[PDB]
Amino acid sequence: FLTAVSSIDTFLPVLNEAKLQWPTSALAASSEELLGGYVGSQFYLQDGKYMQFQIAGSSNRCELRQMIPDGGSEIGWAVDDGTTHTATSSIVVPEQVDGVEEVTIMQIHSGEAPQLRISWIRSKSLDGVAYEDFIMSTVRIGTGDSSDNFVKTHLADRTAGAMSFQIDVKDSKLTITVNGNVVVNGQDLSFWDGTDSCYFKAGAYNNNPTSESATARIKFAALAWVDH
Questions:
Q1: CB 104 within 8 A of CB 205
Q2: Origin, by domain of life (predicted)?
Q3: Is the CB of residue 156 less than 8 Å from the CB of residue 171?
Q4: SS3 track for the chain
């Protein structure tokens, strides 16, 4: 059978601080439900150790959304609140099925927009360099959809093995570390000063697939939100 992620202890700390959105942002299961054995094809314990997310369809998701711990409501923090907000993970990104083109695996999001997406991307050119099968950051420095609103960075090429991530926000600046290596340091987030509705997300958010049936699949070996 499909084993529930909460059947082992590894992910209980983060499940106590998250709700699960699936298959859209409007349909969710509570932290209490996650700790209480929530399971399905979209979210189950794979290989006895991975919190595996699976989703098909354009702009569908299976994604954890940060919550106040111990049954609390939605969290909202600010990039300039003085606190350090940190999300860490260890992720196995398997080879993706044909038709899956981009999968957002971690975010900083607010009430109205994504400050940061970390995504696996099948193919994209950045600053006149074509990359394939890679991990990218997209940071919003504005609210519009023209390219000047974003800073996009090649972080790493996808590996067969687990890849660690750390996202740190402090004093309106962002640092991203991948496999222990800094890949973005001190990126400005001050456009978002005063936005007090920010929160972390992680899982699988399927962006711009070429087939509605192709299932994105992301395996988390570890995930944590922490505050300092």
A1: yes
A2: Eukaryota
A3: no
A4: CCECHHHCCCCHHHHCCEEEECCCCCCEECHHHHHCCCCECCEEEECCCEEEEEEECCCCEEEEEEECCCCCCECCECCCCCCCEEEEEEEECCCCCCCCCEEEEEEEECCCCEEEEEEEEEEEEECCEEEEEEEEEEEECCCCCCHHHEEEEEEEECCCCCEEEEEEEECCEEEEEECCEEEEEEEECHHHCCCCCEEEEEEEEEECCCCCCCEEEEEEEEEEEEEC
Resolution of the deposited coordinates, in angstroms?
A: 1.5
Cα–Cα distance measured from residue 203 to residue 60, given in angstroms and rounded to the nearest whole number: 11
> How far, in Å, CA of 24 to CA of 45, rounded?
21
Residue for token pair 């070429």: 210
**Token duo for residue 64:** 């954890």
Our CA dihedral for 44, 45, 46, 51, rounded to 10 degrees, sits at: 80
In which order are the strands placed within the sheet that holds 163-170? 43-46, 50-56, 215-227, 85-92, 163-170, 173-178, 181-188
Closest CA to 177 of 117, 88, 101, 59: 88
Domain extent, residue 197, equals 1-228
Number of structural domains (the chain) is 1
